[PDB]
From Swiss-Prot:
Binding site for chloride 2: R90, V121
Residue numbers spanned by region Interaction with DNA: 31-35, 86-94, 119-124
Post-translational modification: Phosphorylated in its C-terminus upon IL-6 treatment. Phosphorylation enhances interaction with KAT6A. Methylated.
Protein name (database record): Runt-related transcription factor 1
Ligand binding (chloride 1): N63, E67
Biological processes, Gene Ontology terms: behavioral response to pain; cellular response to transforming growth factor beta stimulus; central nervous system development; central nervous system neuron differentiation; definitive hemopoiesis; embryonic hemopoiesis; gene expression; hair follicle morphogenesis
Tissue: Isoform 4 is expressed at high levels in thymus, spleen and T-cell lines and at lower levels in myeloid cell lines and nonhematopoietic cells. Isoform 5 is expressed ubiquitously in lumbar vertebrae, brain, kidney, heart, muscle, ovary and osteoblast-like cell line MC3T3-E1.
Outcome of mutating R93A: Interferes with DNA-binding
Length: 124
């Protein structure tokens, strides 16, 4: 249940654009190819079997799909923890990326992370 899920992770999860998923918090601006400060997690509020895969993609109007590293994780106890997601492709200082989340239930569901992320060679 959402109340129970919030209660396992108080103060750590944010809405996605889908009522069925929450996520951990990403930086607003990060350095290309740098390890993230908070390992990314996608949390299912609904039933998602263990082993269900989750993949993320990043892009914008200039770049349909920016390079990522380690952009797939598997659900376990309704949480998919990405061990080492990295943002490699750069948005530049003037634009940011939207991060789309795909959860490979049958059939797959798509969610979007709740903020844009800027990726530059130097970072913030
Ligand atoms: Cl790229
Ligand atoms: Cl850049």
């Amino acid at each position: 249940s959402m109340v129970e899920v919030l209660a396992d992770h108080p103060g750590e999860l944010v809405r996605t654009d889908s009522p069925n998923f929450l996520s951990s918090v990403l930086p607003t601006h990060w350095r290309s190819n740098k390890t993230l400060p908070i390992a990314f997690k996608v949390v299912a509020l609904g039933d998602v079997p263990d082993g269900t895969l989750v993949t993320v993609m990043a892009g914008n109007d200039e770049n349909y799909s920016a390079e990522l590293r380690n952009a797939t994780a598997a659900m376990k106890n309704q949480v998919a923890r990405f061990n080492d997601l990295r943002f490699v492709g750069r948005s530049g200082r003037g634009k940011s990326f939207t991060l789309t989340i795909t959860v490979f239930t049958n059939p797959p569901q798509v969610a979007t992370y709740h903020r844009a992320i800027k990726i530059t060679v130097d970072g913030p």
